Design an enzyme around this catalytic site. Structure first.
Site, PDB file in Angstrom:
ATOM      1  N   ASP A  84      20.180 -20.750  -2.078  1.00 27.74           N
ATOM      2  CA  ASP A  84      20.881 -21.803  -1.368  1.00 27.74           C
ATOM      3  C   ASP A  84      20.259 -23.178  -1.583  1.00 27.74           C
ATOM      4  O   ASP A  84      20.896 -24.184  -1.246  1.00 27.74           O
ATOM      5  CB  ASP A  84      21.016 -21.451   0.122  1.00 27.74           C
ATOM      6  CG  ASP A  84      22.323 -20.691   0.393  1.00 27.74           C
ATOM      7  OD1 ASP A  84      23.113 -20.514  -0.579  1.00 27.74           O
ATOM      8  OD2 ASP A  84      22.572 -20.251   1.524  1.00 27.74           O
ATOM      9  N   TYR A 122      16.625 -21.280   6.703  1.00 26.36           N
ATOM     10  CA  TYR A 122      15.531 -20.516   6.089  1.00 26.36           C
ATOM     11  C   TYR A 122      14.191 -21.174   6.377  1.00 26.36           C
ATOM     12  O   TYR A 122      13.180 -20.476   6.544  1.00 26.36           O
ATOM     13  CB  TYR A 122      15.732 -20.385   4.574  1.00 26.36           C
ATOM     14  CG  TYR A 122      17.018 -19.698   4.183  1.00 26.36           C
ATOM     15  CD1 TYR A 122      17.371 -18.473   4.736  1.00 26.36           C
ATOM     16  CD2 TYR A 122      17.897 -20.288   3.281  1.00 26.36           C
ATOM     17  CE1 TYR A 122      18.557 -17.844   4.390  1.00 26.36           C
ATOM     18  CE2 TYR A 122      19.079 -19.678   2.944  1.00 26.36           C
ATOM     19  CZ  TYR A 122      19.404 -18.448   3.504  1.00 26.36           C
ATOM     20  OH  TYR A 122      20.577 -17.810   3.170  1.00 26.36           O
ATOM     21  N   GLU A 204      27.504 -15.859  -4.686  1.00 22.76           N
ATOM     22  CA  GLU A 204      27.823 -15.726  -3.268  1.00 22.76           C
ATOM     23  C   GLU A 204      28.395 -14.357  -2.909  1.00 22.76           C
ATOM     24  O   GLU A 204      28.108 -13.846  -1.830  1.00 22.76           O
ATOM     25  CB  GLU A 204      28.786 -16.830  -2.873  1.00 22.76           C
ATOM     26  CG  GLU A 204      28.095 -18.211  -3.055  1.00 22.76           C
ATOM     27  CD  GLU A 204      28.898 -19.358  -2.485  1.00 22.76           C
ATOM     28  OE1 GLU A 204      30.085 -19.508  -2.862  1.00 22.76           O
ATOM     29  OE2 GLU A 204      28.337 -20.128  -1.681  1.00 22.76           O
ATOM     30  N   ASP A 237      29.666 -17.541   6.942  1.00 16.19           N
ATOM     31  CA  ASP A 237      29.976 -18.680   6.071  1.00 16.19           C
ATOM     32  C   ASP A 237      30.202 -18.212   4.641  1.00 16.19           C
ATOM     33  O   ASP A 237      31.146 -18.652   3.966  1.00 16.19           O
ATOM     34  CB  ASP A 237      28.831 -19.715   6.086  1.00 16.19           C
ATOM     35  CG  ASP A 237      28.637 -20.399   7.427  1.00 16.19           C
ATOM     36  OD1 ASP A 237      29.598 -20.439   8.231  1.00 16.19           O
ATOM     37  OD2 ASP A 237      27.508 -20.962   7.649  1.00 16.19           O
ATOM     38  N   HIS A 241      32.873 -19.095   1.558  1.00 14.03           N
ATOM     39  CA  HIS A 241      32.498 -19.621   0.253  1.00 14.03           C
ATOM     40  C   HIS A 241      33.092 -18.783  -0.870  1.00 14.03           C
ATOM     41  O   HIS A 241      33.719 -19.305  -1.798  1.00 14.03           O
ATOM     42  CB  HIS A 241      30.990 -19.656   0.130  1.00 14.03           C
ATOM     43  CG  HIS A 241      30.341 -20.513   1.166  1.00 14.03           C
ATOM     44  ND1 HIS A 241      28.985 -20.512   1.372  1.00 14.03           N
ATOM     45  CD2 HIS A 241      30.871 -21.330   2.103  1.00 14.03           C
ATOM     46  CE1 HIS A 241      28.696 -21.357   2.349  1.00 14.03           C
ATOM     47  NE2 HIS A 241      29.829 -21.834   2.837  1.00 14.03           N
TER      48      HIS A 241
HETATM   49 FE   LIG Z   1      27.414 -19.812   0.072  1.00 10.43          FE
HETATM   50 FE   LIG Z   2      24.479 -20.101   1.796  1.00 10.81          FE
END
Ligand SMILES: [Fe+3]
Ligand SMILES: [Fe+3]
Ligand SMILES: [Fe+3]
Ligand SMILES: [Fe+3]
Lengths: 339, 339
Positions: A84, A122, A204, A237, A241
């Site tokens: 990410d 994170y 993803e 999320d 994506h």
């Molecule tokens: Fe993502």
């Molecule tokens: Fe992400």
């Protein structure tokens, strides 16, 4: 030449998703593809901040983990953070300059933004479970296993960006640069875009879901529960994506957006298939690294590799690729509680 | 060559804001400049959505406005929409590729994202007060008065982006492109960046505040109150935006970040001063267009021009420029209730 406000009054409902006239007026009263409007609206409805999750119990859990279980957990978290970091910036740098419809442009910026919340979360986790976060963050860049994956993933983005700059400056044609034969082809730039989106879709839709299984396997043992609540939010999320890149790829595929893309996607299909297979194999090889020192209750190299094959088949079908693996049921159905 | 994950393990606390090694790992446990971390955190705490504001009364108000008052209101709203179309995308396309510290990178993406919420909110307003939004949105691109300002503002961004592509591809030096003398100079690219940030600072700190006065003058008459509540939220974001560019400019100025920038900023100072003066004059000339058909209670060409001079002086001092106008008190102190 690229421009941040193109002065031609164009019908944005007839523009292609990519490579048309760059968006001038940002308006949201109409859409060529309302999936992107729906994804924006859903991602906005999901807005969350990492500090609203209590991670205070996770330091104790982490400390209590056997050393090989720390290794599993922190390696997984380092990879998520790697991925990410790329996803926070790359949709904006790589795709925004090429988008010619406002709903896609705004989705990409909302997507990338939501990724920075993932990256911030994170940090929230790392800070709360180790004494010296620098050790963790430095290992992301220098870790031999991690940088293998970073170099492959970032090359799809970097090559798209480089060819873009050539196209915006030079335009199509065979050009002389310091006495070099630089052939700028829009068909080739379109290929770089389509492959890049395929790689981002594997990122993803597969690579992160492998990592979600690792995180939730701890939650199944009632450990690292603050981490698990954050990853639940991240995974919700991530489903948005990967849906966006699914629709981008399929609309490009169908010829509904750009007929030249349909024939490009067909000329690319073996390349895309192979890219997905290589990603799945990389994720299988990552499980060997995760479990190099032993496994834990509910998760080991065998189980995780089964899950790689299971999820890879689902994601590949959804973008029209053939299935590389035998059909199989979900080997970790407890993961569905968390997704 | 630009890269989305630079493989060198660097101390991100020693990188410059711009033109250093592109950010690899996105981490938030430390900052070179914590202003950017504080701005991210504040912008996230402000997260709002346009549909949580009731704009249902504004159609009636708009319909009741005399025709010249409709002209004032809708011209102002078209300009705001123009400006945040640019601001929604341009920080990401223009600045992100050049940032070398993670807190600045994340601020720019959060900033640009918050601008898309502003753009979505202008659609929410337009849709709720006119029968045919297309007429409004098409006029933004073709309006002679509006496109004068769009071309000047977008050129700061476009020229920075174009020179960036040359720098990433070719690197510094005198280069041959199809037999042309393309001189890529980093000192010159740094100048384009510094001027672009000056233009963006005038955009958010002056041009939008002139437009806020127009919107709030209606709210002072208890008209267009749904619009006013949205603009209150936009203005509260705008204060964060202009603070960020203020700190970028002053840190570049001071030599604390990049000593070469300090001498560049001094060689640019007359240019920056003139850019701000030209923007203020453009905003004064815009008030002549706004009030071409007459004025309204509490706001006219004279009052608004006084406010241009008043706010321009404040913003220029804050980035160390000399004041172009006589000192004066706030001519519209009722605006402070809304800010
Ligand atoms: Fe993502
Ligand atoms: Fe992400
Ligand atoms: Fe704005
Ligand atoms: Fe702004």
């Amino acid at each position: 030449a690229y421009t941040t406000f193109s002065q031609t009054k164009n019908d944005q409902l007839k523009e292609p998703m990519f490579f048309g006239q760059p968006v001038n007026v940002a308006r949201y009263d109409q859409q060529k593809y309302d999936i992107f409007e729906k994804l924006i609206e859903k991602q906005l409805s999901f807005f969350w901040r990492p500090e609203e999750v209590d991670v205070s119990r996770d330091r104790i859990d982490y400390q209590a983990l056997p050393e090989h279980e720390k290794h599993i957990f922190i390696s997984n978290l380092k990879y998520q953070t790697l991925l990410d970091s790329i996803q926070g910036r790359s949709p904006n740098v790589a795709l925004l300059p090429l988008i010619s419809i406002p709903e896609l442009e705004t989705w990409v910026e909302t997507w990338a933004f939501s990724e920075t919340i993932h990256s911030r979360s994170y940090t929230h986790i790392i800070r709360n479970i180790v004494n010296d976060p620098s050790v963790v963050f430095d290992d992301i860049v220098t870790n031999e296993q991690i940088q293998k994956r970073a170099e492959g993933i970032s090359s799809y983005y970097d090559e798209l960006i480089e060819m873009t700059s050539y196209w915006h400056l030079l335009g199509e044609g065979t050009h002389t640069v310091n006495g070099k034969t630089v052939t700028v082809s829009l068909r080739e730039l379109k290929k770089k875009l389509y492959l890049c989106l395929m790689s981002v879709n594997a990122l993803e839709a597969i690579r992160f879901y492998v990592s979600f299984a690792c995180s939730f396997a701890f939650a199944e043992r009632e450990l690292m529960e603050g981490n698990a609540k954050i990853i639940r939010l991240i995974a919700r999320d991530e489903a948005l994506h990967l849906t966006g890149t699914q629709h981008m790829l399929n609309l490009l595929r169908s010829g509904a957006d750009d007929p030249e893309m349909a024939e490009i996607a067909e000329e690319c299909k073996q390349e895309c298939y192979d890219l997905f297979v290589q990603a799945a194999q990389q994720e299988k090889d990552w499980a060997d690294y995760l479990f190099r020192d032993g496994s834990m209750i509910g998760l080991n190299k065998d189980i995780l590799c089964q899950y790689v094959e299971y999820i890879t088949n689902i994601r590949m079908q959804a973008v029209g690729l053939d299935l590389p693996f035998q059909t199989r049921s979900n080997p970790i159905p407890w993961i569905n509680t968390w997704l």
